[PDB]
Design a protein around this ligand. Structure first.
Ligand SMILES: [Mg+2]
Ligand SMILES: [Mg+2]
Lengths: 771, 708, 140, 50, 99, 64, 65
């Protein structure tokens, strides 16, 4: 009780000093960030040596007082003095004490049952240990060529996110009292908020610590590291024990976190979405963004939107680049061409147009590049370095591991090189590859012959032979490349040499973004053709625990099931704004208006007519018995409500299974039609998901009843509205302007509001109108 | 961190809404950052408009702000057609079809009045003017917008305000006609003058240099400028075979280099005591329990051999022996004052203010001079010191080494085994002995500097060792003990603002006749006679041998106390250098060659009878350990100059190894820098001469070098 | 590129215009001209800004640009006030804090003044190559 | 190949040439930040050494 | 880093405190009790840099009023003690205004 | 199960099979004689026996 | 004690209900997932594949009595 009083009196003393008073008054609160930077700048010159000098003394250490007197005896066992009443050296409320007392309280101290609290705070570290438990071992030795520079996620963890948003999570989970109300992350990514805030908020221990450790928990460290060719981010945590220049170890890849495959699943998701945008070429800009913002991903423990995964994902695939290009995410330093990845290390030049002949006696324009340019090629199990000058490869070296992958590197990079022989081979190219069939769209030519090579096996041999072939001289024996990808060096290709080893990958920290052309082409950096149109033509539909919406062009939607699910979505979505909606009715305790709601009449005809009254009786019963506060489940009210509309008859027959066009919805008992999720706010109707954030008091949501309750917004500061703590905000009803302290000290006012709507579309439609 | 403006804008704002800011910002006005400002305002309008459609296909509002200028003019004349209202000169943002009036929206950071009086001054009552503050302050014309759009726009402006606070962009976002006009860099007349006379060119005014810079286009005249620069630079073509001699290596001439190590190694003598855990745990009381033995009886005679200051050292020795009886602090306040500073005298300082008269009348013979170190010559004894530190001492190990961690089959078996073997080899050597005594005693001094500052204390010179027996009877026990090299004395430990250096007086026992050449710094006495015996298959009585007492004074910097206090580092630098050799070999054969490489691989070690000699890698490992330990002991600025300029010699040598025709440009200058860093340092000159012999033998193997 | 310098300068302008001047305290030791001694950058900057506050009033800039504007504004200042501790003999000398004055002529030289550091931690040279620690007004 | 190392690397470079070069780099960028670029060298073009 | 129980702070020497450097530090300590005070009022001050347009003192005062109302309304503290805290707050506002 | 009931993981099954049985590399006897002369890899021979258990309780409930 | 070879998880919750003369709602009960690895010889695959044999060996023993 005096803990606040003494703080108030301390403030009185401080503002009584004018020198501190004016510097406390003048300026924003941000000056604290500077003020803290003005202290304890002095550091000792010697890292260990000064510490040795420190521990030499018997009572060097600064330690707290109150806790020790509370728990344990200050005096010693062996009669070596421990405690005094004197505060010496720096003057702070801590009194000095000997080092060994720490060991004593670690021995005989009276503490119990801290075990479970520790681990899930440090689950980053504890997990990095758990993974080492399951692996097996083998030892050998070799002269090993490691891949020298890869920038690769190390210490990977599920639900990894950017630094700013993880700072938001930090603020929300640490303390509610001072926090800003942060829309973008909390609205979309809620349910990780529920978990983290739930486990860490109830037991107030080591607030700062837990914060700064959670910062590192979700932050994969991507550094520039040597790897020996196992690129899974789990092996990156401990490379040292595994591999090195002379090192080798075995039996690893098996154990991994669930992230590594989930990322690939997201790559397939972006594949299907980009195909959906490919189906209709009327406009590719307006549709794909809809397909993005609509889709909802289910991560193993959490539901998260596709937008915040795409924009903020680490790995840039040829597809992922396309999915990001629709949004405002800037990810550069990546070149994607077909399956191959590329990086540009040198030179520059302009795109020029040259019309060259095919074998069908027809002329088609080819856009080529004249530059002296040195780029690094990247393909599966193979790396290389190429340099092109004036539309023809100048210098080439291959660092690839496998012969076939070497040949693929050579080929693809010849396609991007576009020599004259590129025109000479045209075996039936025009009949199909010339005109891609999509609304009669002519597909670019580099990708045309790329696809011609991806077609069959002999097409690779064609252009492989299109390069000059010569018997290589002695001294090139090891560097020479056969037609089939080997080193025998009897016959070899011209202007190419293999290297024994791998080839290092360049890295640049850069962000570049520009809008995309209507054909799924990204002209970013005023050129550079990074989007590679369609990378791979996989026609397949397979998904697991994935959500789609809004005329997806994939038919998962039955007529009866869309009647049920949309009928529910009317009720769930349309309510929560104000009076004559579910929240005000629940606060009034009046459930009769809730029965008569016009959105229930929409759902009425879909119920089974036989038991309609028999269902309505038990339904009305359940809704009425939950009107008493604290006993009501807020999901069960949505589940049970639609059947209450009809006149209750005394059935005496059990109404557990409610047939709505021959499909049952049970109380509790999450099923195909109605999925009732535990300990988070959501729900699943077959292959799709919906939830309503602003007003949920459902009893299991206790941990965030302060975060979830917000549908509010800011209006004006004019009324004098009693200053209400965040826990007092649940009581003030609708249309009530109230005053609240926000964040780091800025105070604003709100009312019960219709939520912020059309953050994007509001601008997008007008921008489309102005053309 | 965000590196660009588009990053900042697209981060908190809508992606397509930024593009209008970029485009409008490209042409009509030219400012790079201000996109963010209109990035707010523009979007502030859009959410405003879309919200209401008035009972018709046509929308309630129309947006003239985001469009193009010339198009916005005519589209604003459309309103003169439709509603026939006065054609206002100022182009507004939005036109309402329900209210049929002009609408414009400002956004200000400061209190709303400051800007609202500005815009209201511009357009008066002719338009509906709505001025919002990010903080929730509101200023308006007569009627406000509908209650929903108020709430949404205010929430957005609040969140955007919080983002700007997090990125700390505030004064720059201020309204154009107030703060934008002062975007300029403050120009003071002092700074403008300074800049105007700071210019390199014949031009004086900065504006002319600015013009020559911005308008610069270089012609290809730097080829003739570079060839004339080439003609001016006549020299530095370089050929190895022409300079391949390198005039061997120059070496200084003079007196033989002395013993610079703070302790004596080869000639030092030991006193064995089987240690008690509770008695020896102090390590200060170690000598107090030593004195109950025969140590207390030894006394030197007044007439020393080769002593500089005999009577002083003898008296101090008696003060040590008398102190050890009572307590290990020496109480003499007058004695230490002269010995301190390395017989450094405290010199009285006369202020300059009173000194002017003493310049007018010159007295005390006023002058100024500095002194330089006298160069020495290549040491002989150093080789014998190396050969003594190389062989295994009878005591098993001198260096505390912690326990081994638990092991898994794969690596930790290899690592643990390699450490067990290498540790087992290097612990028995005498080099490990000097390492151990250095760690233990310099640690003792390190504690004594915190314990008793400004006090005189008697610190022992000791090393701990447990005895090995491989005869392999199960036996009573292996002997665990500690032995004493000598006694040590510490002076005032006070710490200056600039660097202080403590002074130390070392007394060591020796069984060996002193050599005036290398011991010149040491003051030797005739101490007594010490009994030494052995037991063998022969008779081996052993008689007695005379005991000499070596004394000296040295300076120890606190930094030296630290780096010499941890000598264990040497092991690591040996380990790596050894271990790599075993891997690089074995990794060739893809087999475990480590054990085979250690024993089989031959390393050239020394020369005997004019023949090059080599030893296996396990015993030649001692050579590397001794070399690193000397690097730790003997390190001087001279040594670091020597090695850092020596790497060039080594790289040229291996350049001639693989016949790469290496060259370095002014080898006379390189050998002058190598010569410059050779003065008195024994290790420096030693590695110099050994480098000479390396050049000779290498030139004999094949000649890219010279032999005199 | 043809836009190399324009683009790199664009990035620099971005990062610097964002920058709070408090991050100027991050770095090596620099020369505090108030006491005319070498200090860690944080304390030296505290003395500089504090002296500006006691002379012309508190500094509300909170940006690198406005800090630079104040730096160039001080060069035209004819008088500057310092926090300088002067020893007063009360004979025991108590170093009472004091307020000192300086003229534009001296302040300019103190602003362009750089200080010498006898080299430490340098590896591999017999003779020492000293390192310079420029003042607080030159640093931004 | 050659391994080059430079002596007196700092004593040879001059803030005047850095002023000219900085004026060349800032030519097109902005006149608002260009005056802010040229101010750094001129303080080393007139500089005092204790 | 694992916190465990073993992490502690090291005392500075008595060197800088004996010279005038402390007589200069009399300002830095005045920053000290200020920052420590605001950190006692705002727990996330060190972690999340404080933001918003407000004075340090204003945010401290209104936040103290909010915590006082919190502990008074539901939790256990006296009403007259609440009014005592309010009295200390306004009396502090007087001396803050006079400067 | 969504696509087809075959699992495509070639690395995952290699560790799990053999009952977490590891494939042990075999060194021929002809080259082994030197490794007897120079003993490395800690060469030995041993076999293992099953550990005995005690009377089950649950079995009765399983029968019932 | 008896499951030492099995690796158990906490799988979820499963719904179980009955209909009787009483109310018998049944709510839900947590579902656990037991995992293990075993060895099957082809001979064991056969003799365990035909378990019907047991019936006969019971039948005879019963019928004789
Ligand atoms: Mg306008
Ligand atoms: Mg306007």
């Amino acid at each position: 009780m005096s803990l606040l009083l003494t703080i108030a009196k301390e403030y009185k003393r401080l503002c009584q000093d004018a020198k501190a008073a004016q510097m406390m008054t003048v300026g924003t609160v941000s000056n604290y960030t500077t003020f803290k930077k003005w202290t304890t700048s002095r550091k000792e010159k010697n890292p260990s040596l000064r510490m040795r000098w420190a521990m030499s003394s018997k009572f060097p250490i600064i330690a707290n007082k109150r806790m020790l007197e509370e728990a344990q005896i200050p005096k010693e066992h062996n009669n070596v003095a421990l405690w005094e009443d004197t505060e010496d050296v720096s003057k702070r409320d801590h009194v000095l004490a000997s080092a060994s007392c720490i060991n004593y309280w670690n021995f005989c101290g009276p503490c119990v049952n801290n075990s479970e609290v520790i681990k899930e705070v440090y689950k980053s570290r504890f997990g990095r240990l758990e993974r080492r438990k399951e692996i097996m071992w083998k030892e050998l030795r070799f002269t090993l060529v490691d891949r020298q520079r890869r920038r690769v996620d190390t210490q990977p963890v599920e639900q990894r996110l950017r630094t700013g948003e993880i700072k938001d999570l930090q603020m929300w989970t640490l303390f509610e009292d001072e926090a800003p109300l942060a829309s973008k992350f909390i609205l979309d990514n809620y349910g990780l908020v529920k978990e983290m805030r739930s486990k860490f908020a109830n037991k107030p221990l080591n607030k700062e610590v837990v914060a700064h450790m959670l910062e590192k928990q979700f932050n994969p460290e991507s550094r520039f590291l040597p790897v020996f060719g196992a690129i899974r981010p789990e092996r990156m945590e401990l490379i040292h024990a595994l591999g090195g220049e002379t090192w080798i170890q075995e039996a690893n890849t098996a154990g991994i976190s669930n992230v590594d495959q989930r990322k690939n699943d997201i790559r397939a998701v972006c594949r299907k979405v980009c195909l959906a945008a490919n189906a209709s070429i009327m406009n590719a800009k307006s549709k794909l963004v809809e397909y993005i913002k609509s889709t909802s991903m289910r991560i193993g423990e959490t539901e998260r939107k596709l937008e915040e995964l795409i924009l903020e994902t680490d790995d840039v695939s040829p597809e992922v680049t396309l999915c990001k290009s629709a949004l405002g995410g800037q990810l550069g330093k990546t070149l994607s061409f077909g399956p191959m990845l590329l990086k540009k290390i040198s030179g520059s030049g302009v795109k020029v147009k040259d019309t060259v002949y095919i074998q069908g006696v027809r002329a088609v324009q080819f856009e080529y590049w004249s530059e002296q340019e040195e780029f690094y090629g990247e393909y599966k199990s193979a790396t290389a370095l190429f340099s092109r000058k004036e539309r023809s490869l100048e210098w080439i070296t291959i660092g690839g591991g496998i012969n076939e992958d070497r040949k693929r590197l050579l080929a693809m990079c010849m396609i991007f090189c576009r020599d004259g022989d590129y025109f000479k081979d045209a075996p039936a190219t025009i009949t199909m590859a010339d005109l891609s069939t999509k609304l009669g769209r002519e597909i670019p030519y580099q990708y045309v012959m790329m696809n011609w090579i991806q077609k069959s096996e002999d097409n690779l041999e064609a252009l492989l032979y299109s390069r000059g072939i010569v018997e290589t001289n002695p001294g090139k024996m090891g560097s020479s490349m056969g037609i089939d990808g080997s080193k025998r060096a009897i016959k070899s290709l011209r202007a190419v040499t293999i290297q024994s080893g791998k080839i290092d990958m360049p890295e640049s920290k850069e962000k570049i973004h520009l809008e995309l052309s209507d054909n799924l082409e990204a002209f970013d950096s005023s050129g550079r053709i990074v989007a590679t149109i369609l990378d791979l033509p996989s026609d397949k539909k397979v998904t697991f625990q994935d959500v789609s919406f809004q005329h997806p062009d994939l038919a998962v939607l039955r007529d009866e099931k869309t009647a049920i699910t949309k009928g529910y979505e009317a009720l769930i979505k349309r309510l929560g704004t104000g009076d004559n909606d579910i929240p005000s009715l629940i606060a009034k305790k009046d459930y009769l208006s809730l029965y008569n709601l016009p959105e229930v009449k929409l759902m009425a005809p879909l119920i089974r007519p036989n038991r309609k009254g028999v269902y309505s009786r038990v339904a009305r019963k359940l809704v009425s018995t939950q009107v008493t506060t604290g006993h009501y489940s807020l999901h069960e009210l949505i589940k049970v409500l639609p059947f209450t509309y009809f006149a209750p008859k005394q059935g005496m027959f059990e109404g557990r299974l409610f047939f709505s066009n021959d499909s049952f919805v049970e109380p509790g008992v999450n099923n195909n039609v109605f999925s009732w999720s535990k300990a988070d706010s959501s729900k699943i109707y077959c292959h799709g998901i919906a939830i309503r954030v602003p007003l949920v008091v459902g009893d299991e949501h206790m941990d965030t009843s302060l975060a979830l309750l917000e549908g509010f917004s800011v209006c004006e500061n004019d009324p004098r509205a009693p200053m209400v703590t965040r826990q007092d905000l649940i009581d003030v009803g609708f249309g009530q302007k109230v005053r609240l302290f926000v964040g780091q000290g800025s105070v604003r006012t709100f009312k019960r509001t219709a939520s912020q709507r059309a953050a994007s579309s509001d601008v997008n439609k007008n921008v489309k109108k102005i053309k | 961190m965000s590196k660009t403006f588009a990053e900042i804008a697209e981060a908190f704002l809508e992606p397509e809404a930024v593009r209008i800011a970029k485009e409008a910002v490209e042409e009509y006005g030219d400012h790079e950052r201000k996109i963010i400002q209109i990035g707010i305002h523009f979007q502030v309008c859009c959410m405003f408009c879309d919200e209401y459609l008035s009972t018709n296909g046509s929308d309630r509002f129309v947006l003239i702000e985001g469009r193009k200028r010339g198009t916005a003019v005519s589209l604003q004349n459309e309103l003169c057609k439709s509603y026939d209202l006065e054609p206002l000169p100022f182009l507004c943002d939005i036109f309402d079809r329900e209210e049929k009036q002009f609408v414009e929206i400002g956004i200000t950071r400061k209190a709303d009045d400051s800007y609202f009086q500005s815009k209201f001054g511009k357009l008066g009552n002719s338009c509906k003017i709505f001025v919002f503050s990010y903080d929730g302050r509101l200023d308006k014309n007569c009627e406000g917008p509908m209650e929903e759009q108020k709430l949404r726009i205010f929430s957005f402006l609040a969140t955007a305000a919080d983002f700007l606070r997090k990125e700390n962009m505030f004064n720059e976002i201020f309204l154009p006609d107030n703060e934008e006009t002062i975007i300029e860099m403050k120009k003071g007349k002092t700074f403008l003058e300074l800049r105007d006379e700071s210019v390199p060119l014949p031009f004086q005014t900065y504006e002319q240099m600015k013009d020559y810079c911005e308008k610069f286009k270089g012609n290809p005249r730097e080829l003739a400028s570079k060839v004339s620069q080439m003609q001016s630079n006549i020299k530095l073509p370089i050929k190895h075979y022409e300079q391949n001699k390198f005039r061997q290596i120059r070496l200084p001439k003079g007196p033989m280099a002395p013993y610079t190590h703070k302790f004596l190694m080869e000639e030092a003598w030991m006193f064995t005591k089987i240690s008690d855990p509770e008695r020896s745990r102090a390590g200060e009381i170690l000598i107090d329990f030593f004195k109950k033995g025969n140590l207390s009886a030894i006394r030197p005679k007044d007439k020393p051999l080769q002593g500089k200051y005999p009577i002083h050292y003898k008296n101090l020795w008696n003060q040590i022996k008398a102190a050890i009886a009572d307590r290990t602090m020496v109480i003499n306040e007058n004695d230490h004052s002269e010995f301190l500073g390395g017989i450094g005298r405290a010199s009285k300082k006369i202020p300059e203010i009173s000194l002017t008269q003493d310049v007018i009348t010159t007295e005390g013979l006023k002058q100024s001079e500095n002194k330089l170190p006298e160069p020495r010559s290549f040491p002989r004894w150093f080789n014998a010191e190396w050969m003594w530190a190389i062989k295994d001492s009878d005591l098993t190990g001198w260096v505390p080494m912690a326990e081994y961690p638990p092991a898994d089959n794969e690596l930790e078996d290899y690592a643990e085994h390699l450490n067990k073997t290498m540790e087992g080899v290097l612990q028995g050597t005498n080099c490990a002995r000097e390492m151990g005594k250095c760690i233990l005693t310099v640690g003792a001094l390190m504690t004594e500097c915190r314990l008793f500052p400004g006090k005189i204390k008697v610190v022992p010179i000791y090393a701990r060792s447990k005895e090995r027996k491989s005869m392999q009877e199960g036996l009573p026990v292996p002997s665990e003990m500690d032995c004493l090299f000598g006694i040590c004395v510490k002076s005032k430990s006070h710490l200056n603002k600039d660097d202080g250096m403590y002074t130390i007086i070392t007394f060591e026992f020796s069984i060996r006749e002193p050599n005036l050449e290398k011991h010149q710094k040491y003051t030797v006495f005739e101490a007594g006679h010490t009994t030494v015996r052995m037991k063998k298959g022969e008779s081996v009585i052993g008689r007695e041998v005379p005991l000499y007492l070596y004394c000296r004074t040295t300076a120890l910097s606190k930094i030296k106390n630290d780096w010499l206090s941890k000598a264990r580092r040497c092991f690591i630098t040996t380990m790596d250098t050894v271990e790599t050799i075993c891997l690089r070999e074995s990794a060739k054969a893809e087999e475990n060659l480590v054990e085979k490489t250690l024993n089989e691989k031959q390393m050239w070690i020394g020369k005997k009878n004019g023949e090059l000699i080599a030893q296996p890698l396990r015993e030649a490992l001692r050579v590397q350990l001794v070399q690193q330990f000397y690097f730790c002991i003997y390190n001087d600025s001279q040594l670091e100059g020597f090695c850092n300029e020596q790497k060039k010699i080594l790289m040229a040598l291996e350049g001639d190894k693989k016949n790469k025709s290496s060259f370095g440009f002014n080898p006379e200058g390189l050998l002058e820098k190598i010569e410059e860093c050779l003065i008195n340092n024994p290790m420096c000159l030693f590695m110099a001469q050994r480098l000479n012999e390396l050049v000779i033998e290498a030139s004999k193997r094949g000649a890219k070098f010279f032999k005199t | 590129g043809e836009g190399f310098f324009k683009h790199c300068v664009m990035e620099a302008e971005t990062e610097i215009l964002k920058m709070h001047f408090s991050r100027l305290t991050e770095g090596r030791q620099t020369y505090d001209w108030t006491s005319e001694r070498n200090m860690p950058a944080a304390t030296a900057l505290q003395l500089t800004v504090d002296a500006i506050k006691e002379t012309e009033g508190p500094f509300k800039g909170t940006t690198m640009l406005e800090y630079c504007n104040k730096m160039i504004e001080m060069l035209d200042w004819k008088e500057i006030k310092f926090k300088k501790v002067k020893t007063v003999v009360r004979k025991t000398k108590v170093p009472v804090m004091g307020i000192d004055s300086i003229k534009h002529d001296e302040f300019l030289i103190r602003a362009l003044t750089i200080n010498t550091m006898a080299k430490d931690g340098e590896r591999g040279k017999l003779q020492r190559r000293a390192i310079a620690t420029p003042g607080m007004i030159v640093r931004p | 190949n050659i391994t080059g190392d430079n002596s007196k690397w700092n004593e040879c470079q001059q803030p005047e040439a850095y002023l000219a070069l900085l004026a060349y780099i800032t030519k097109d960028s902005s006149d608002l930040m260009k005056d802010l670029c040229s101010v750094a060298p001129v303080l080393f073009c007139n500089k005092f050494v204790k | 880093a694992v916190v465990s129980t073993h992490s502690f702070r090291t005392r500075a020497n008595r060197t800088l405190l004996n010279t005038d450097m402390r007589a200069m530090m009399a300002e830095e300590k005045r920053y000290q009790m200020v920052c420590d005070m605001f950190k006692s009022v705002f727990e996330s001050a060190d972690i999340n840099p404080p933001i918003g347009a407000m004075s340090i003192g204003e945010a401290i005062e209104e936040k103290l009023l909010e915590r006082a109302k919190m502990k008074r309304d539901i939790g256990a503290i006296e009403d007259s003690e609440y009014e005592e805290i309010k009295d200390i707050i306004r009396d502090a506002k007087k001396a803050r205004l006079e400067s």
